[PDB]
């Protein structure tokens, strides 16, 4: 059969209050969005790592570890006093990264 | 230094016309979105593989690099009804293992 090299875990995120946008700024994410008289609760699909490196790595010639990478998704947010549609950083994957020894 | 086990590539995607939503249905993705008298071009951040995996113990493991996905909300069309739907886009390149024999 088939296994992950790095064990991931995926959930819905419905209680996001803060985030950093693509321009590097810390912003406030609203709980509710309004698109043409339609009230949707603002939810996010996120994937990250599940906490001796990665599975199946040739450990003789390689150090390694599992790391959470991210994606940018559009979201309704607040940069101080100005509300806007901004791209924000959320967890999206767990991937293995290598390192040569010595 | 530090390397990827699987080589990925990330781009903006601004010409998406179709997609499959989270319920398994093939839907049409609109080019433009309208949120409170504000017209935004509908863009997507996607990552995928660059055409086994680097650094794998190939003696005990078969392996290959594979594109995984995420769900992101988008303005869409299921036939005649416009709606805010989660759709599947490329989000990562990850290695998957397989025991030999």
């Amino acid at each position, epitope marked *: *059969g*088939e296994f992950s090299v790095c064990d991931s875990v995926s959930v*819905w995120v419905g*209680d996001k209050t803060t985030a950093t946008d693509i321009k590097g700024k810390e912003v406030m994410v609203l709980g509710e969005v309004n698109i043409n008289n339609s009230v949707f609760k603002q939810y996010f699909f996120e994937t990250k790592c599940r906490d001796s490196g990665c599975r199946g790595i040739d450990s003789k010639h390689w150090n390694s570890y599992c790391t959470t990478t991210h994606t940018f998704v559009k979201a309704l947010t607040m940069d101080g006093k100005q509300a806007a549609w901004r791209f924000i950083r959320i967890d999206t994957a767990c991937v293995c990264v290598l390192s040569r020894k010595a | 230094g530090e390397f990827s086990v699987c080589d990925s590539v990330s781009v903006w995607v601004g010409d998406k016309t179709t997609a499959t939503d989270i319920k*398994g249905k093939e839907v049409m993705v609109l080019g433009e979105v309208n949120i409170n008298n504000s017209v935004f071009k509908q863009y997507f951040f996607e990552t995928k593989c660059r055409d086994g995996c680097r650094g794998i113990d190939s003696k005990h493991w078969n392996s290959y690099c594979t594109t995984t996905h*995420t769900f992101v909300k988008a303005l869409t069309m299921d036939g005649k009804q416009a709606a805010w739907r989660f759709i*599947r*886009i490329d989000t990562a390149c990850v290695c*998957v293992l397989s025991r030999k024999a």
Partner: antibody
Amino acid sequence: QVQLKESGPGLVAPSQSLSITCTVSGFSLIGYDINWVRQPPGKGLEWLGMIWGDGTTDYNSALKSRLSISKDNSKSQVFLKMNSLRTDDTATYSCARGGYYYGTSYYFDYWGQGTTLTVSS
Amino acid sequence: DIQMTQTTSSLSASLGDRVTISCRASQDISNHLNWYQQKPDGTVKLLIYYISRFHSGVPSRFSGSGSGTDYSLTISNLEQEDIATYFCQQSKTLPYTFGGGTKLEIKR
């Protein structure tokens, strides 16, 4: 430390309503889909519907809109409701957590035991 | 809907044998195919998802394959605890559907 437990009446007459609650523990309903499933005696499983993480729902069209699911995230409970029962609704009913491997595939990773329901006069 | 079919709903094998549970989708489901084990005690457990992937805490001897609309679960080295019913499920599209299951007798 992840379980689901369903509690229900056991007997309801034709044309009366049905309420089952799924009590959940070891995880939060804010983050996970919950599915409802049904196995009539000596027959195959049948998916009834689900409440997504965000509170939205989808139902099996075969039920002709007789079924509804609602939830209270703070109380860790999902609520199945069915109107206008028939002897055909005689089954064991179970709730199951939805689990995702990225947005790539989807499965039911954790299953409740099941509550037996007989519809009869 | 997408029908999932398990044409042989009964199977009998001996300890150590390799058994194949098969499943057929009525339309292409690509890889959105899960395998469950319902033991006689009533409990249900996810064995395999996405055709061939293992859920955590599942034996090496389980194995998932597929060709076209056909999908197999293979249990190598059959052990006594494998007395159960084995059923598939497509997670491609709503409504989700299940095969009617394949019950496994272990000879003695």
